[PDB]
Structures are given as structure tokens and as C-alpha cells.
């Protein structure tokens, strides 16, 4: 027998629970943990094919694809409004969220070890067969609504609409045509195979996913409940719920569910999030001025002038100037040589 | 809470946006984020086999091989012109770019989840057989318009060259051939299977690729966007695009789309790259003379007549006089310099 | 001049399969913005 010690001063965590916790404002950056989930979006056909796409075709052809929503998982979003960190200020170092850790996960395996209600039979005397046939687990969350870049190949493909697919087909669309740039601002809109990050246009989202080819791929899961993911970086900063409104993203192709005739349809599933949060300081740059200017713009119309900047030029001129030069030899200097022989 | 907490004395972006930025004035470290990307070169049959190759042969022979371009990816390359730090620069310290981070990524798969559209019905009431196979995603980044090194089997082949293959067709061309040394200095021309690093020379390029042989071989990604790879080393360097022009280099075989006919043909896809650049300062490393020789003589004529030059010499002797000294009693010596000291040899 | 020369892809100007440069140097006491703004043609439209 030996002696007993401590407990500690505890950053309170009276606050507790689900969605309720949002409700207020609290003592400095205290910090909080959040349990939610967002469900799947397979573009599904059913409520039996809940967490599943519709069974699939094998072929069609380039020229000939146009599905319907039902085999078309689109991203699972929800935009999550968090209460403030920001409300009667002007200026100063203001606060955005930097939410510190999350574990979130595509949730729901154990039942799919059933192949004895059938699945599709493996063969032999052998029972059903699982689900599997490539899988993607991915998510990205960002404090921004997500700039996508749609990618098709086969721009002689077709598909519907709210199945917001990469928009504007070209040969180039097959290796993306500049367009197809989108914004995640609709729970399940962008069928996942159609949209791709306009990623470096999404700094303030962090994505990770692996799409996991082969052609049946045995999956593996790891419920070692301890990985912690910190929502930071090299500076130790994550995405910012700048807008304390959150664009949450994932795709988690659980695999292909082998509907009984080898009809396969995806199983994709719901995601969970357990979100460890903190109140973070930035520096207002949002002040009055910006409003003022804001103001004027509404206050205006929008006249159809004529266009002379960017791609519409008839303005010919951007140069900086600069304070009293001495007397260089010349002021025209090639800062990239242009080799063509050289 | 919200709060005027000391809000990080973060760096200073000044502007960003593409190409326009280059033109800029000077600001020491200076450093930059390149969000580029390259489209693939597959032998790209067309606008649909735009980013994909032509299909391929199946049981053959060296002998039974003439290539033609379409199936032939060659590596994708570029001179990216890079700013000149040195336009004015006149100091005895020299600035150069030294190359700091890339997080690049082969980009935009998502259509390729078609088990549909001609994806050879594997069977069942399940789907197709889409793409896949081996994949090689690779890139090399050079500072240089690099040393390639050609690799051929099959010098019973009948190869193209727009898809500039290596030349030379010894047995030894089938193993190393020290002559199939080349140099990538060409968009879609080194067909990939044909060419290999002359890595003995590749020292001022960094490449990373992992060629991933195998029948269908799965693509397992990662889509992080949250940790670069850094282009430094012991001496903190990557390629040296000494070249303020950029040698860009790549191959990204996604695998092969398998048509319903098993028309299999490589599929390649574009890579995005995200580069971090700084200004590194050096010494002089090379002298005036070595330079001078140029201007001068270059904006000039040649003089050579009866032959002297070389060795064809109505030239006569090259020796060393010099000094005035007592009397070595061999003085019609043969006076040398072993090189480091004086060799003094004769027959007398 | 002395250099050898090549063909590749056009990564600049119009013909750029590059996308972007993001100028750094200096510092600053961390604003709010996780981007840049300037004109109300940046910010506005």
C-alpha cells in the first residue's frame, strides 16, 4: 500500500452534450467536444438501399452515360453554424474558431458481415460474399465552402443536373476544362465522381482520403480509438471556421455491396464527428471601411459599361511606379530571358 | 468570447495570383507558392484519348514491334521561365533560387469510377472493368534540362522519334548503353519506356516516382493537403533551377482503360504541383576570363592560315626561361617542372 | 546562351498550365482574412 494523488485543476467541461453545447459564450477559450453525425448520400434509390447507391451498370459507353441520381453519391455536407467568436468589436485582434481536434468517421460496419441473409453468394457451398470492391475514405472539412473542380473524362458523357456534375464538356474536360469549378453549399449535390477539389483553392480545408483501387479490395478498419486528429498544421493552425459555419465534407465509399446477383451497388455510409474545439484570435480587418464600401455597391446599380480589365481588356495598364530613382541605365528589363536557341 | 489576442506576427503575402507576380522587385528570402499542374502526354490519340493513350499489343517479339506515337507517352516537360534576380545584380554576392517545398499531386480522378461506359463487364450483374494496371506516378523536377538515359530492349523494334526515343542498338542497348545517354529537352518525346535517368548526371534534379508494376494494381491515395515535401537535403537543396527557367518532369500512368474489348490503353492524368521557392546567395563560382573569351572574340573574325594551332605546328618551342641566376653549369638543360617542382632531365 | 535547349509545355502567360504564385516575404499581425482582398472588385464581385 502506497499513497494516492491528484486530480487537477480542470478546464471545466461542464458543458456537455450534443448540439446544446453551442448555445452560449464562455470564459476565455475554454474548450469543448462535439458529438454529431451526418448521414450518407449515395444519390440512393432506397431506404433499403439506405447507405447504398443503386446497383450499377457495367458499361454504357462514353457517348452514352447519363444516369439518374440514384447511383450517384454526392457529397455529404451540412453547413454547420457554430455560435460566434465575434460580435460588437470594430477592430483588434478578433476571433475565429480554431477547432482543435476531431475524430470523425464513417460509421456502421458490423451488419455487413452478413452474407448469410445472403449478399450475393460467393460460390461453392460458400455463403454470401461481403461488400468490397473499392473504397474511398475521405473527408475534408474546411471552414470554407469547398471550391471544387469537377472532373469528368468522357465528355461525351451525360448525367443529370442537381447531380451537379462538372460543368462544361470538352476534350479538355476529360482532363478538366477550367471550369467545373464549384462550391460546396448543398448537402449532396456534387456526385462525388464528378467533383474533385479545386483544391489549392481550398487551403482552409483539409482533406484526406484515399481512394483505394484494385478491383475488390479487402478493406480493413481500425477501431483503436485513440488516433486524435488535430486540426492544425505547420504553424499549428487548421482551417478556420471564420464563418462559424462549417462546410463539412466526406466521401467514404464503403465498398460495393454485392447485391444478390452480383448486382453491386455501393455501400457508402454516414459520418460521425467528435469535435474538439477552441476559440481562436485573428486580427479584424473587417472593419467599417469594408462596410462602407459594401454599402456603395448596393447603392449602386450595375451599369453595363464596357469591359476593359482582365479578359475584356481595353485597359492597357498596370505598372507600379516608385520613389526617385537615381538614374539606372534603362527601365526595361527582361526578367525571363526567353530561350529558344539559347 | 472573441478577443484582441496577440494575433500572430504571421508572414506577409503581398500578392499572389499567377504569372503577373513574377515581375516583381526584390525582397530577400522571397518565396513563393506555385500552384501548377501539367496535363499528360500519352501518345494521346485524340481528344477523348486526351490524357489517355492508345491501346496496346499483347504477345509479341522485339522483332514484331514498330511503335507509333499514340500509345506512346513520353514524359511531360517544361521550362517554366523564372524571374531574374540578377537583372541588375551587380554584387559579389550572387542570388539564385534555392528550391524549397513541393506538395504536388496527381489530380482529378473522379470520373474514373466508371465501371460503366465501356468498362469491360467483368461479369455478373455487377459492372465493368474500368482502368487500372500498373501505374507510375513519377515526376522529376529538374533544375537542368536533364540527363536522360535511354533504355531499350528490342533493337529489333522500329521506333518513332517524335516520341524521341534514345538511339543506339547494340546488344548492350538491351542492357545499359552508355551511349543511350540523353537528355530530356523535349515535351512528349522521351517515351517513357524508352528513357531512364541518366542519374549520374541527374544530381540537379530530384525525382520521386514510384512505379508501381502489376496487373491492375490498386491506387491507394492520400489527400492530405496539409504537409509538403521539402526540396532541401543536407545542403538544403533540391534540383537547382539555376535555370530561372524550370525543368519540369513527369509520368503518371494511371493504368489502362480496358474497353469492353479489353482495349487496353494507358490512361494518364494531370498532376498539380505546389512549389515553394527561395532566394539563395552564393559566391562567385566562375571567373572573368572564362567569361571574357566570349564577347570579345565572338563579336569577331578568325585567324588561322598555314597551320600552327593545335599541334599542326610550324610553331616551335614552349619552355621556361625566367630569372637570372648564377650559373648552373647545365644551362642548355631541359628545364622542367615536373609540375610541382622542377624536373631536370636530359641525355647529355 | 550557353545553355542547350528544349521543348516542353507552356506554363506561363496565357498558355499556363500553372495556376498561381503567392508572394511572400515580410510579416503582419495576423488579420482575420484567410485570403486577400483589396479592391471592391476583389472583395465585391
Author numbering:
A (entry chain 3): 15 to 356
B (entry chain 2): 15 to 362
C (entry chain 6): 312 to 356
Provide the publication's sentences verbatim.
Images of unstained, frozen-hydrated virions and VLPs were recorded using an electron microscope with a direct electron-detecting camera, allowing us to determine the solution structures of the virion to 7.6 Å and VLP to 9.1 Å. Each penton contains five copies of the major structural protein VP1, and there are six distinct conformations of VP1 in the shell. A homology model of the BK VP1 asymmetric unit was generated based on SV40 using the SWISS-MODEL server and flexibly fitted into the corresponding density of the virion map. At the resolution presented, the gross fold of BK VP1 is extremely similar to previous structures of the non-human polyomavirus, SV40, which shares 81.7% sequence identity in the major structural protein. Strong density is observed inside the virion, as two ∼24-Å thick radial shells separated by a gap of ∼28 Å. Interestingly, the density associated with the N termini of chains 3 and 6 appear to be a weaker feature within the virion map. We propose that these densities correspond to some portion of the 13–15 N-terminal residues of VP1, which are not resolved in previous polyomavirus structures.
BK polyomavirus is the causative agent of several diseases in transplant patients and the immunosuppressed. The crystal structures of these viruses revealed that polyomavirus capsids consist of 360 copies of the major capsid protein VP1 (Liddington et al., 1991). These VP1 molecules form 72 pentameric structures, or pentons, that form the basic building block (or capsomere) of the capsid. Each penton consists of a ring of five β-barrel-containing VP1 monomers (Nilsson et al., 2005). Together these form a T = 7d lattice, with an invading arm comprised of the C termini of each VP1 undergoing exchange with neighboring pentons to stabilize the capsid shell.
